[PDB]
Design a protein around this ligand. Structure first.
Ligand SMILES: [Zn+2]
Ligand SMILES: [Zn+2]
Ligand SMILES: [Zn+2]
Ligand SMILES: [Zn+2]
Lengths: 237, 84, 62, 146, 89, 50
RNA sequence: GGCAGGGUGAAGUCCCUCAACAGAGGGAUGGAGGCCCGCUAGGGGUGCUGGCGUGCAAUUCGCUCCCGUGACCCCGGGCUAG
RNA sequence: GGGAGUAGCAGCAUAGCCGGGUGAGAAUCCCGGCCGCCGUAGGGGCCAGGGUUCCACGGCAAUGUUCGUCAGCCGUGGGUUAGUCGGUCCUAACCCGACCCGUAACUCGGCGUCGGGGAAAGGGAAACGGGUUUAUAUUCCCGUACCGCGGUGGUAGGUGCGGCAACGCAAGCCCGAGGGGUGACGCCUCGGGGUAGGCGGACCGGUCCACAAGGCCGGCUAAGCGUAUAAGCCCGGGGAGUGCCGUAAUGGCGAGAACCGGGUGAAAGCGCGAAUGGCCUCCCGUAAGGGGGGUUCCGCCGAUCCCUGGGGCCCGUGAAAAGCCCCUCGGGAACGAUCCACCGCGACCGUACCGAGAACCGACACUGGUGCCCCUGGGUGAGAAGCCUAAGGCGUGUCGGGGGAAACCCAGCCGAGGGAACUCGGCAAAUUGGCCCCGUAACUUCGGGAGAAGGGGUGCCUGCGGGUGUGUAACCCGCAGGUCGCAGUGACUAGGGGGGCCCGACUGUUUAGUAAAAACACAGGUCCCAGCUAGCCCGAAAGGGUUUGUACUGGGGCCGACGCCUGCCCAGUG
RNA sequence: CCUUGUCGGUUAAAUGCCGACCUGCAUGAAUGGCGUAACGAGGUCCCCACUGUCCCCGGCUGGGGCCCGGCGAAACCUCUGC
C-alpha cells in the first residue's frame, strides 16, 4: 500500500520539520558548575514574544554581563532583581532548590534530575503545587493531576507562567488557523481517513465507514495504529 | 455605539454564528479598555503583545495574562507567597 | 494543459552544465556532481557493466 | 541603404525616423552619403529636414471650460460619478473645521472673545453644529457674544 | 529598467538634462537617526548619513562636546549624580 | 550588459570560428571530392550545448 | 516584486436642545471586514454542448460568465525520488 | 504512381492608391503625397535564454506559404576599450570536506567538532553632462568632480576656547581590549512639506488659415561644492483645575500645562558649475564655410515619485553578518592629524544585438507559453474603463485580382399581427441599465435582507445665488426663466425582477486534456495515548523526526457554523 | 417495489411542483436527528415583463464558397464499378 502521514513525518522532511531558525534561543538554567553555592544576582532588561514557546520570555543581565533568557513569570517588571541560588529569597521569579521551598508554594520550570535545565510546567499559564517534603524526595502535583517525586536538589522557579487564557477567545477563521499553523509548521489542513481510498488508510473505501472496531492493540505494528490506541474505555462518561 | 446587541463583532456581519460572535465581543470589550498600573496607580495600561502589558504615562512594562493583565492563579500565588 | 504550453517555461537556469573532467553537459549545477562521470561525488569514474556508453566511446563489443 | 541615412539623421536630429524628410530630387546625392560628415553636410544644406510636430489644439476645451465656469454643462444629465466621489467626504470636513478654528483664533486675538467662550465655541465646532462661518456668526449674534 | 533597479531600495528620481532628455537617477537610502542606549530617545547633535557622507566630516562635527554622548542629557545627569553620590566615603 | 563566464565565451568563439564552408582551393585540389564538412550549423536550426 | 477607480460605514471618540421624579429627541467625527461593483493589471474556466477539429494549436479562438487586500498572484535561491 | 494541378494559402489587427526611380525583369524594393491601424500597448527600457542573428559592400542556385532587384538567407571584410556600472567581499535557508560511528564493504548512511562554500533584484567605498563611429560608450575625447592607498609641506592639538544649559567649535600620533549606535526590517489607514508632469494668460520669433478672428512649434540647464527650515525630540524661564491648550482623528498637563525665548534637525530650493554648451530662427558665392539675433515673465492643478510624522491588527511578532561612526580603558614615543595645498598608483572577467503575432521553448518566420518584468501626453469621464486623438511605431498579425456571380456555410442588423403555442428544459436572443429625489415587504443569528420591490426627473441657451479660498484664480453644491427634437446616462459606458422547494452553513479547493458538484477543507463539538531515557514515527545499524519543544503541550480518530436535542442493549466481535 | 399511492391547491386539459394522510418492500438520533437568517456560474416549480424560440418565414451587411494568375500536399487505393 501507500504510506501514512505519521509515517512520512519520521523521515524528517521540510513538510514536517520545525522552523527553529525563526525562534529565540533555548531556555535553560545556568549550570551547577558555576553555582556551587555562589547565588548570583541579575536584572531584567526586556520582555519578548517568542514564536516557539507559547509563553513570553525575559532577558536578564547577570554578574559578569552575561545575558540569559528565562520563561517570564506573571507580574515580572523590567528593572527587577531576580536571584538564583540556595540563599535566594522566596519571591516571584527566583530560582531555588526544592529543599528550600515550603509546602503550598506555586512553582514552575522544574528539573527532573539536577543540572538538567528545566523540563516540566513550561507552557503558558501553567503551575505546579508542592505537596510534601522529605529527606529522600519532594512530591509535587503537576498540571495533569499526577503526583510526582523529585530529588530535593532539583531546581525550580517560584510563581506562575505568564500568558494564560489563550483559549477563551475562539479562532474564527480558516485563515487565522492557517497563520497559526504556519507559525509552527503543523500539518494543516487535515484529511479524514474514512474518506481516503484503501491504499491510503486502514479505513477507506467507496462506502465511507469504519468496518471494524476503532480500538487498536498496543502491540499492533506501524501502519495500523489509527483510531483509539489501547483505549481503556470509550464514550462520553 | 450604533448597535444594540453587537459590538466589535459587527465587523464581519451575519457570519460565524451567535455564540461565537458574543464571545469575541465580550473578550475584546474587556481587553481594549484601560487598566490600573501596579507602579503609578493610574488607568493607563494597554496591551503590547500576547502576554505583555505597558503603561503609557510611566512606561511600566510587565508580563501578564493573554487578554487581561492578571489571572486567578496569579492572584492566589501572590497572596500565598506574600504570607509564607 | 500539460503539453505545448508548459514547454514555454524552459527559460530558467539549466539543470546540467559542462563538466570539467568528462567534457559533456551532465554536471548537475545544484547538487554539485556529474551524472556521467561522478565528478564531485567520487574520485573514481562512474562505470557500470549494464551501460554501453564507455564501450561505444572505445569502439568495444558489448 | 537609405535606412542608414534615415536612422543616422534621426539620431543626429533627436527625432523619430517617421519624422525625417528626404528630398526626392536628390536620392542619388543621399545614397552617395555614407559618413556622418556627409549626412551633416546634407542636413546643413537642406536635403534632409526634420518636419514639425503636428499639434492637437485644445481650443474647443477652452471654450467648454469657460462656459462651465459661467454655469453651463453641469446638470443632472452630465454627472456619471457619485456625489461623494465628485466632492470628497473627509476633505469637506477638513476645510470646514480648519476655517472655523482659524477664524476663532483671529477673533480671540482681536479681543472679542475670552477664554471661556473661545473654549465653549471650540467644543461646539468640534461637535459639528455650525457647518459654516455664517452659521457660526448667526449663532454668536442670537446669543450674547458678538 | 534593469532588475537591480526594479528593487525599491533605490528611490529613483526624474531629472531633466541641459539637452532636454529627462533621465532617471538612482540613489541609496539614508540610515535612520541615532538612539539612546537605555531610553530609546533620538539623539541630538549627531547627523544622519551613509559612511560616504560621514567620512567627509571632522570628528567634532559628528557628536556633541560633553561626556557620554551616547546618552541623552537626562540619563547623563543621572549617571553623573550617581557616580558623585557613590564617591562620598 | 549581458553577463558571461569567460570559459563559456571562449567555447562560443570557437564554435563560431568553426562555422564556415570548405575553401575553394581545397575543392580544386581534390577534384570535387571534398565539398562539405559535418560542422555547418545555423543559429536557428541546431542548438549548441551552451 | 505586484494588485485603476468607486461604494457601505463596526468598534473607539464626542456635540446640541428641552429638561428633570423620570426621560425624550436630534447631529457629527472615525475607517474595520477571509464585505460589495468593477474585461485596472492579474488569475480562473460556467454555458453556447458555438468556431476549429489531416487545426494557428498533440487542448487553441470568440462571445457569455467567476475571483479580484487575500486560505491572493508571481519571481530568484534551496529541500523531499519510485 | 492514382488521389490532383485538387485541398489549403479567409475567420482572432479586412489596406492600400497616385506620381517618380532602380533594374533584364517590379501588385510585393526605394523617395514624396493622400488614406489608414496601435495608442496603461503592436510605443519606450531591460533580465533570463539565444550566440554573432550586429555593421557596410556585393548577390539571388536554394530558404521566405506567392513575387522579389528585398531580407534574421548567401559571400567578402569589420565590430564589444571602465579606480567609480556589475562580479570578487558578508552572511540567510542550505551544501561539501577531514576526523568520528555504522556498514561484509562502498562512489552508501549519519550526529557532534574543526574548516570551507552559498545571493549579477538581500547587505554592501567612490562621476555627471556634452560630443565622437558604418557598428562601442556613465568605458573613447573635451569640461567639471569624487574614493582608497602611499607620500611632500604647513596647521589645529600635545601645552586651546565660547555658552546657565540644550549645544558650537579644525580640537594630537601608534598598537590592543571593552561597550553603544548604525547596518536592521510585517500588514492596514491618515495628515503635512515638496517634485516630475500638465493647464491658463502676456511677450518674442517662425508657420497654417479668402481678410479678420484664430490655431500649432520653440522659449533649456546634470553630478559635485557651499547655504535652512518643517515635523519630531530637547534646554532654560514660567507656575495652572467649576479648568485651560491643541488634532484630519486619537489626545496633553504639579510624574509640571498655558505663555516667553532658544538648540538640533529631511526631502527640496537658491548660488557657482555655465553659455559663442543645447534648441529656434535670419542673411551672400555653396566645397570647405562666413556673419547676426532670441533663449523673457506671472498664475493654477498635481502624483502610484521623494521626505517626514501620527494612529490601528496579531493564540500570527515580520533575518543575520561583514563593514562604518562614537566613547572609555591599558600600554608606548615626543611629536603631530578625521584641517589646508600638491604629487603618485588603481590588477582580473563582462560590455555587440533580440528581448518576442520572425532573434527565447514549443519539430515551423506556430493566434500558445516565458515577460506585463519596469514605465507612459490631450478630451469626455468616478476612473490605468470604453470611444476619439498627439508623440513614437507600423501598412510583414507576408498570396493577390474579379463579381448585382447564384445555392449553401461562418460572424452580424432589421422584421407586420400574435407573444413560449417551440423545446427534455425559455437553450439562444431579447428586456433592464449611469446619476439625483421619493418610497421600501416577509423573515432575521438584529449584523442583514436592500441597489428589495416600485415611481418621477436629466439636453442647449440667458441669467441668479452658495462653500473653502485674498482672489471676477481653481474645484464643487443649488435656483429661475426661454427654447428644439420621435427620442436629452441621445453615441460609448451601462443590473431583467419576484415567489416556493431539495442540498450544502458561509469565503475557499478539486478529476492538467469529456465530471466544479450535493464531493474535499473550514471554524467548532467530542473521544483516545502520553510526566520526557515519555507517547507516535524513520532506519540494516549508527543515529534521527515531533524537539531552540514539556499536558493552555505533542501525537491519533469521528462529526462538521449556529439553535433545540442526542433514547434502549456489554450476549457476540474487538 | 405495487406507484401516475389517496385527498387538496396550481391548468381548458398535470406520469409535474407544492401541502397533508401513514399501508416506513428497505427512516431515525455525533456512519448524527430535526430546523435555520445570510450565501450558491449547484438542482427543481410558478408569476410579471420581454422577445424570430415558434405560427412562417423574409430582406440586407462583411468573410468564404464560384472564375482568373501563382505555389502546391495528405488521408486513402486487390482489380473494377447500372
Ligand atoms: Zn503606571
Ligand atoms: Zn563528468
Ligand atoms: Zn536616554
Ligand atoms: Zn530619558
Amino acid at each position: 500500500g501507500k504510506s501514512l502521514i505519521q509515517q512520512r513525518r519520521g523521515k524528517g522532511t521540510t513538510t514536517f520539520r520545525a522552523p527553529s531558525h525563526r525562534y529565540r534561543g533555548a531556555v535553560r538554567y545556568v549550570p551547577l558548575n558555576l553555582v556551587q553555592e555562589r547565588t548570583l544576582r541579575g536584572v531584567v532588561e526586556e520582555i519578548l514574544h517568542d514564536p516557539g514557546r507559547t509563553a513570553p520570555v525575559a532577558r536578564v543581565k547577570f554578574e559578569d554581563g552575561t545575558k540569559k533568557l528565562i520563561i517570564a513569570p506573571e507580574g515580572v517588571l523590567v528593572g527587577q532583581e531576580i536571584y538564583i541560588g540556595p540563599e535566594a529569597p522566596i519571591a516571584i521569579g527566583n530560582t531555588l532548590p526544592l529543599a528550600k521551598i515550603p509546602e503550598g508554594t506555586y512553582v514552575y520550570d522544574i528539573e527532573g534530575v539536577p543540572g538538567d535545565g528545566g523540563k516540566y510546567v513550561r507552557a503558558g499559564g501553567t503551575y505546579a503545587l508542592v505537596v510534601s517534603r522529605e529527606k529522600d524526595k519532594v512530591i509535587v502535583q503537576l498540571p495533569s493531576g499526577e503526583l510526582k517525586a523529585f530529588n530535593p536538589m532539583c531546581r525550580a522557579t517560584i510563581g506562575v507562567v505568564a500568558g494564560g487564557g489563550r483559549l477563551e477567545k475562539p479562532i474564527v477563521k480558516a485563515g487565522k488557523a492557517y497563520y497559526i499553523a504556519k507559525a509552527r509548521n503543523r500539518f494543516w489542513p487535515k484529511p479524514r481517513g474514512v474518506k481516503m481510498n484503501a491504499v491510503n488508510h486502514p479505513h477507506g473505501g467507496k462506502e465511507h465507514h469504519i468496518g471494524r472496531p476503532s480500538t487498536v492493540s498496543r502491540r499492533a505494528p506501524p501502519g495500523r495504529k489509527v483510531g483509539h490506541i489501547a483505549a481503556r474505555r470509550t464514550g462520553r462518561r | 455605539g450604533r448597535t444594540t446587541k453587537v459590538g466589535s463583532a459587527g465587523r464581519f456581519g451575519p457570519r460565524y454564528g451567535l455564540k461565537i460572535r458574543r464571545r469575541v465581543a465580550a473578550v475584546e470589550a474587556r481587553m481594549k479598555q484601560k487598566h490600573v498600573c501596579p507602579v503609578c496607580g493610574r488607568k493607563a495600561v494597554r496591551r503590547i503583545s500576547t502576554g505583555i502589558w505597558q503603561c503609557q504615562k510611566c512606561g511600566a512594562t510587565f508580563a501578564g495574562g493573554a487578554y487581561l493583565p492578571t489571572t486567578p492563579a496569579g492572584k492566589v500565588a501572590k497572596r500565598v507567597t506574600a504570607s509564607k | 494543459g500539460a503539453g505545448t504550453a508548459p514547454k514555454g517555461k524552459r527559460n530558467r537556469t539549466p539543470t546540467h552544465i559542462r563538466c570539467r573532467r568528462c567534457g559533456r553537459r551532465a554536471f548537475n549545477v545544484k547538487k554539485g556532481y556529474c551524472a556521467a562521470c561522478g565528478f564531485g561525488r567520487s574520485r573514481r569514474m562512474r562505470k557500470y557493466s549494464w551501460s554501453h556508453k564507455w564501450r561505444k566511446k572505445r569502439n568495444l563489443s558489448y | 541603404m537609405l535606412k542608414t541615412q534615415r536612422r543616422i539623421a534621426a539620431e543626429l536630429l533627436k527625432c523619430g525616423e517617421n519624422r525625417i524628410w528626404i528630398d526626392p530630387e536628390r536620392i542619388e546625392d543621399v545614397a552617395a552619403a555614407i559618413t556622418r560628415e556627409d549626412i551633416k553636410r546634407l542636413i546643413h544644406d537642406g536635403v534632409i529636414k526634420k518636419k514639425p510636430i503636428k499639434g492637437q489644439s485644445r481650443a474647443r476645451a477652452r471654450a467648454f471650460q469657460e462656459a462651465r465656469k459661467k454655469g453651463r454643462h453641469r446638470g443632472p444629465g452630465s454627472k456619471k460619478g457619485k456625489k461623494t466621489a465628485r466632492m470628497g467626504k473627509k476633505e469637506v470636513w477638513m476645510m470646514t473645521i480648519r476655517a472655523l478654528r482659524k477664524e476663532l483664533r483671529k477673533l480671540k486675538a482681536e479681543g472679542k472673545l475670552d477664554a471661556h467662550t473661545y473654549r465653549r465655541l471650540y467644543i461646539r465646532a468640534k461637535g459639528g453644529q455650525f457647518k459654516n462661518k455664517r452659521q457660526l456668526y448667526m449663532f454668536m449674534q442670537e446669543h450674547g457674544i458678538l | 529598467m534593469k532588475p537591480m533597479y526594479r528593487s525599491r531600495s533605490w528611490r529613483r528620481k526624474y531629472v531633466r538634462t541641459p539637452g532636454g532628455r529627462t533621465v532617471i537617477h538612482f540613489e541609496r537610502r539614508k540610515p535612520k537617526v541615532a538612539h539612546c542606549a537605555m531610553c530609546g530617545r533620538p539623539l541630538n547633535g549627531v547627523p544622519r548619513g551613509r559612511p560616504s557622507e560621514l567620512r567627509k566630516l571632522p570628528k567634532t562635527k559628528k557628536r556633541p562636546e560633553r561626556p557620554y554622548p551616547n546618552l541623552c542629557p537626562s540619563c547623563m545627569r543621572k549617571v553623573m549624580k550617581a557616580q558623585v553620590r557613590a564617591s562620598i566615603t | 550588459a549581458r553577463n558571461k563566464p569567460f570559459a563559456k565565451k571562449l567555447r562560443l568563439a570557437k564554435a563560431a570560428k568553426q562555422n564556415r564552408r570548405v575553401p575553394v582551393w581545397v575543392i580544386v585540389k581534390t577534384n570535387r571530392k571534398v565539398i562539405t564538412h559535418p560542422k555547418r550549423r545555423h543559429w536557428r536550426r541546431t542548438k549548441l550545448k551552451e
